[PDB]
Structures are given as structure tokens and as C-alpha cells.
Design an enzyme around this catalytic site. Structure first.
Site, mmCIF file in Angstrom:
data_model
loop_
_atom_site.group_PDB
_atom_site.id
_atom_site.type_symbol
_atom_site.label_atom_id
_atom_site.label_comp_id
_atom_site.label_asym_id
_atom_site.label_seq_id
_atom_site.Cartn_x
_atom_site.Cartn_y
_atom_site.Cartn_z
ATOM 1 N N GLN A 1 28.202 41.963 86.044
ATOM 2 C CA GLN A 1 27.001 41.676 86.819
ATOM 3 C C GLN A 1 26.720 40.189 86.921
ATOM 4 O O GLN A 1 25.709 39.791 87.494
ATOM 5 C CB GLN A 1 25.791 42.361 86.200
ATOM 6 C CG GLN A 1 25.868 43.880 86.224
ATOM 7 C CD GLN A 1 25.120 44.483 85.072
ATOM 8 O OE1 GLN A 1 25.432 44.209 83.910
ATOM 9 N NE2 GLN A 1 24.116 45.306 85.378
ATOM 10 N N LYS B 1 19.401 37.547 82.322
ATOM 11 C CA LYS B 1 20.510 38.127 83.058
ATOM 12 C C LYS B 1 20.116 38.207 84.527
ATOM 13 O O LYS B 1 19.104 38.817 84.871
ATOM 14 C CB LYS B 1 20.798 39.524 82.505
ATOM 15 C CG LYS B 1 21.946 40.305 83.171
ATOM 16 C CD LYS B 1 22.189 41.579 82.364
ATOM 17 C CE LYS B 1 23.128 42.554 83.056
ATOM 18 N NZ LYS B 1 23.473 43.663 82.123
ATOM 19 N N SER C 1 29.407 35.693 80.822
ATOM 20 C CA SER C 1 29.458 36.308 82.133
ATOM 21 C C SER C 1 30.065 37.699 82.004
ATOM 22 O O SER C 1 31.008 37.905 81.240
ATOM 23 C CB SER C 1 30.314 35.458 83.071
ATOM 24 O OG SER C 1 30.296 35.997 84.381
ATOM 25 N N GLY C 2 29.513 38.651 82.748
ATOM 26 C CA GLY C 2 30.033 40.003 82.746
ATOM 27 C C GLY C 2 30.241 40.462 84.170
ATOM 28 O O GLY C 2 30.302 39.632 85.079
ATOM 29 N N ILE D 1 26.272 36.140 85.444
ATOM 30 C CA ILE D 1 26.018 35.172 84.387
ATOM 31 C C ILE D 1 24.763 35.510 83.596
ATOM 32 O O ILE D 1 23.763 35.958 84.154
ATOM 33 C CB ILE D 1 25.881 33.748 84.981
ATOM 34 C CG1 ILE D 1 27.241 33.283 85.510
ATOM 35 C CG2 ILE D 1 25.348 32.788 83.933
ATOM 36 C CD1 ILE D 1 27.175 32.044 86.402
ATOM 37 N N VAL D 2 24.835 35.292 82.288
ATOM 38 C CA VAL D 2 23.678 35.381 81.406
ATOM 39 C C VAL D 2 23.432 33.989 80.836
ATOM 40 O O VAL D 2 24.379 33.336 80.403
ATOM 41 C CB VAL D 2 23.964 36.334 80.244
ATOM 42 C CG1 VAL D 2 22.742 36.448 79.361
ATOM 43 C CG2 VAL D 2 24.397 37.704 80.800
ATOM 44 N N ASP E 1 31.646 54.019 77.184
ATOM 45 C CA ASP E 1 32.412 52.797 77.419
ATOM 46 C C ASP E 1 32.022 51.694 76.467
ATOM 47 O O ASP E 1 31.924 50.529 76.852
ATOM 48 C CB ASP E 1 32.250 52.312 78.864
ATOM 49 C CG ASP E 1 33.429 51.426 79.333
ATOM 50 O OD1 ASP E 1 34.434 51.321 78.623
ATOM 51 O OD2 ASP E 1 33.343 50.850 80.412
HETATM 52 C C1 LIG Z 1 29.356 35.601 74.975
HETATM 53 C C2 LIG Z 1 27.864 35.800 75.142
HETATM 54 C C3 LIG Z 1 27.287 36.784 74.130
HETATM 55 O O1 LIG Z 1 27.947 37.165 73.164
HETATM 56 C C4 LIG Z 1 25.861 37.298 74.288
HETATM 57 C C5 LIG Z 1 25.487 37.993 75.493
HETATM 58 C C6 LIG Z 1 26.484 38.245 76.521
HETATM 59 C C7 LIG Z 1 27.529 39.240 76.251
HETATM 60 C C8 LIG Z 1 28.526 39.501 77.301
HETATM 61 C C9 LIG Z 1 28.463 38.774 78.585
HETATM 62 C C10 LIG Z 1 27.401 37.776 78.823
HETATM 63 C C11 LIG Z 1 26.398 37.507 77.784
HETATM 64 C C12 LIG Z 1 24.118 38.469 75.639
HETATM 65 C C13 LIG Z 1 23.713 39.160 76.840
HETATM 66 C C14 LIG Z 1 22.337 39.660 76.893
HETATM 67 CL CL1 LIG Z 1 21.852 40.455 78.270
HETATM 68 C C15 LIG Z 1 21.381 39.477 75.792
HETATM 69 C C16 LIG Z 1 21.805 38.772 74.590
HETATM 70 C C17 LIG Z 1 23.187 38.282 74.546
HETATM 71 C C18 LIG Z 1 23.688 37.610 73.299
HETATM 72 O O2 LIG Z 1 22.945 37.520 72.327
HETATM 73 N N1 LIG Z 1 24.926 37.124 73.231
HETATM 74 C C19 LIG Z 1 25.330 36.435 71.989
HETATM 75 C C20 LIG Z 1 25.374 34.947 72.132
HETATM 76 C C21 LIG Z 1 24.113 34.236 72.300
HETATM 77 C C22 LIG Z 1 24.149 32.791 72.475
HETATM 78 C C23 LIG Z 1 25.440 32.105 72.469
HETATM 79 C C24 LIG Z 1 25.436 30.593 72.648
HETATM 80 O O3 LIG Z 1 24.358 29.967 72.457
HETATM 81 O O4 LIG Z 1 26.472 30.022 72.982
HETATM 82 C C25 LIG Z 1 26.715 32.815 72.296
HETATM 83 C C26 LIG Z 1 26.678 34.276 72.125
#
Ligand SMILES: CCC(=O)c1c(-c2ccccc2)c2cc(Cl)ccc2c(=O)n1Cc1ccc(C(=O)O)cc1
Length: 342
Positions: free
Chosen positions: A31, A49, A28-29, A33-34, A145
Site C-alpha cells: 500500500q 500510513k 514501504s509495503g 510508504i509509512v 498470510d
Molecule cells: C521497516 C519498517 C517497520 O518495521 C515498521 C512498520 C512498517 C512495516 C512494514 C512496511 C512499512 C512500515 C510499521 C508500520 C505501521 Cl502501519 C505501524 C508501525 C510500524 C513500525 O513500528 N515499524 C517498526 C519500525 C519503526 C521505526 C523505524 C525507524 O525509525 O527507522 C524502523 C522500524
């Protein structure tokens, strides 16, 4: 017989195209939840996203709009790729949410920061950050940033930057992370491309220390942590600050600062083999050139790419790749809708 279905992800509803299956929240950021998901059409995993009513204020609206436009122009291996964009709503008046489908990686840099990394992986991650930032700079985009929570990595050590930066007010509990911003951002003094070098230096330093370099409740504490470690800046730096800012900086307690050997002792680096001893001294040299308060004296992106710690990775295909205001909430809504519908 609608193209979409809905599932609950926390206290939010994700309404997505049927091709996307088995959503799972990964993070989550600001904006929101992803989710990770399986794309039955591409036969691969993706990230989804959700932007909820991004036009609801200027700050959300401008980021969402910028993100959409820049994701469609920029194509670089160290910048995250947009795969698809949709809204489930059928008209502008009904329009509420925007869903961005992105390529999916394995982990956040924050997770990698916690690890003890060899020099080959450490240097390759840094090379890739520099390449992505370089590409951005070549399109006239200065990120300002960069932070580890917004950079993601794969198991094979490939790296991608998630966002385009920007550097105002929102009534949410979400707290923005400012630990990685340059002195020139902190003291609000105007900036060039190597504003982003400072942030890479903060991340690199944290990869080594496994602690955040310059924490602080706000800019006051943060500047305290900067000068206490790097020491009080020189006079020629003082002259470039706005008058009210200069008085403040010139009147803080003075510090000599620490040497970089003290800041990042050999105990923090792989240092058993001759190879690792040489690499440690090289890593420390680059750190000493990025964590420099005065931007006129801070190393550039190109010189960093040439630095010995980094340049073993150099590839011109990657480094010299071809480059790509305000409204009311109703105006922003139509801008973003238009962008979404192509
Ligand atoms: C903590 C989430 C994270 O690092 C992340 C986010 C993310 C970054 C900041 C906020 C929200 C999302 C992300 C966001 C967009 Cl738009 C596209 C790809 C990713 C991604 O590849 N990861 C890695 C990731 C992928 C799967 C898992 C898993 O399967 O648990 C864990 C990490």
C-alpha cells in the site's frame, strides 16, 4: 489557515494534519510508504500510513476497507492500534487519499530474525504472536498470510501484528511474499484456524536458521522446498486435495524428509547451560508440531500456547481477551469515504 500541510516523502506527497511533525519514511509495503512522525497533540511518536486512491481497484479497495473496519473493532496488545484516521480532501468527489495513524514500534521482525536471540526473548515473541492470532481467531478472523515483514517489535520485546491478512491481480512491480503460507493455502484446499500455526512455525524456524525455510520463485518451487525438508506427505493427506491438485502432488519426486534434529541442530540454539539445553529440545519439539504438512495433524493455537516452550508466559487476560463481497470502483470509493468520515 488550513488544518493540513504537505511534505515530499520520496516521489509521494504526504498531506497531513499539522499535529504531525517531522515525518520520516521508515518502510514501504504493497500500500506504499509509512512514515514515523511526532504527534504534538498526544506528545508521542506515531506511524502514518498513506493509502493512495485505495478504491482504484478491487484488491486495494477491499484491503483498505477491511483494514479500516477491523482496526476500529479490534483492541488487543498484540494487534497494532489505530490512533487516528483522516483524509485531507473535503468532499467525496474530491476524495483521493486515506491516512492511517498507528502506534509506532522500534523494529521489524525481519531485523530480529537476523539476531541471535536467547530463549526467553524467542519464546516471548512467539507467545505474543500466538496471542494476537488467538484474538483474531476468536473474532472469526483467520489471517492466512502472517509474515515477518508485517510484525513489529519494541526494544522491550513487545510485539504487534500489523495486518489482518486475507491470503488477486495488480499491475505493479511489487512482489508479494508467499514463503510463509500453509500447504493448504499453497495447494488451495480449504483451511481452519491452524493454517496460521504453519506461518508461525516458518517464522520460528527462520529465527533459528537465519535463513528462509521454504523459498521459491512460485508455488512449484515452494512445494519442492517443503517436501524436500519435511518429506512427502501421507496418503490420508492426499485424499483431501482437489482432483487436479492431487495428481500433481502424487507425481512429484518422493522424499523421506529430514528429522527435526537434522533440520534444526543444537548448533543453532543457545545450548551452553542445562537451562538452554532443555529449552533447545523444547523449541525443537514445538517446531516439530507446527511445521506439519497435514493440518489435521498440525498443533492448534491453544495447545501451542500450552506447550512448555511457550506456557511460561501464559496470561488469561492476554489469551482469553474479549473478542470484537464485491463492488465497482465508485462503490468502493463511497464505502471507504463513509468509513473514514465515521
Ligand atoms: C521497516 C519498517 C517497520 O518495521 C515498521 C512498520 C512498517 C512495516 C512494514 C512496511 C512499512 C512500515 C510499521 C508500520 C505501521 Cl502501519 C505501524 C508501525 C510500524 C513500525 O513500528 N515499524 C517498526 C519500525 C519503526 C521505526 C523505524 C525507524 O525509525 O527507522 C524502523 C522500524
Amino acid at each position: 489557515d488550513n488544518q493540513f500541510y504537505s511534505v515530499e516523502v520520496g516521489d509521494s506527497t504526504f498531506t497531513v494534519l499539522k499535529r504531525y511533525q517531522n515525518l520520516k519514511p521508515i518502510g514501504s509495503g504493497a500500500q506504499g510508504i509509512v512514515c514515523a512522525a511526532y504527534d504534538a497533540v498526544l506528545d508521542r511518536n506515531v506511524a502514518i500510513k498513506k493509502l493512495s486512491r485505495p478504491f482504484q481497484n478491487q484488491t486495494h479497495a477491499k484491503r483498505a476497507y477491511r483494514e479500516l473496519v477491523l482496526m476500529k473493532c479490534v483492541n488487543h496488545k498484540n494487534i497494532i492500534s489505530l490512533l487516528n484516521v483522516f483524509t485531507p480532501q473535503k468532499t467525496l468527489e474530491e476524495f483521493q487519499d486515506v491516512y492511517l495513524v498507528m502506534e509506532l514500534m522500534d523494529a521489524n521482525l525481519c531485523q530480529v530474525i537476523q539476531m541471535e536471540l536467547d530463549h526467553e526473548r524467542m519464546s516471548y515473541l512467539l507467545y505474543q504472536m500466538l496471542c494476537g492470532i488467538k484474538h483474531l481467531h476468536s473474532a472469526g478472523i483467520i489471517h492466512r498470510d502472517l509474515k515477518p515483514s508485517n510484525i513489529v517489535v519494541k526494544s522491550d520485546c513487545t510485539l504487534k501484528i500489523l495486518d489482518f491478512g486475507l491470503a488477486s491481480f495488480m499491475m505493479t512491480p511489487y512482489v508479494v511474499t508467499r514463503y510463509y503460507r500453509a500447504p493448504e493455502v499453497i495447494l488451495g484446499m480449504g483451511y481452519k484456524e491452524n493454517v496460521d500455526i504453519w506461518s508461525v512455525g516458518c517464522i520460528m524456524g527462520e529465527m533459528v536458521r537465519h535463513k528462509i525455510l521454504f523459498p521459491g520463485r512460485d508455488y512449484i518451487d515452494q512445494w519442492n522446498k517443503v517436501i524436500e525438508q519435511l518429506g512427502t506427505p501421507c496418503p490420508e493427506f492426499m485424499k483431501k486435495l482437489q482432483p487436479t491438485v492431487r495428481n500433481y502432488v502424487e507425481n512429484r519426486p518422493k522424499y523421506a524428509g529430514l528429522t527435526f534434529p537434522k533440520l534444526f541442530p543444537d548448533s543453532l540454539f543457545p545450548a551452553d547451560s542445562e537451562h538452554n539445553k532443555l529449552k533447545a529440545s523444547q523449541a525443537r519439539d514445538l517446531l516439530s508440531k507446527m511445521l506439519v504438512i497435514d493440518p489435521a495433524k498440525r498443533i492448534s493455537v491453544d495447545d501451542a500456547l500450552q506447550h512448555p516452550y511457550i506456557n511460561v508466559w501464559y496470561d488469561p487476560a492476554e489469551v482469553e481477551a474479549p473478542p470484537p463481497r464485491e463492488h465497482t470502483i465508485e462503490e468502493w470509493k463511497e464505502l471507504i469515504y463513509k468509513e473514514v468520515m465515521n
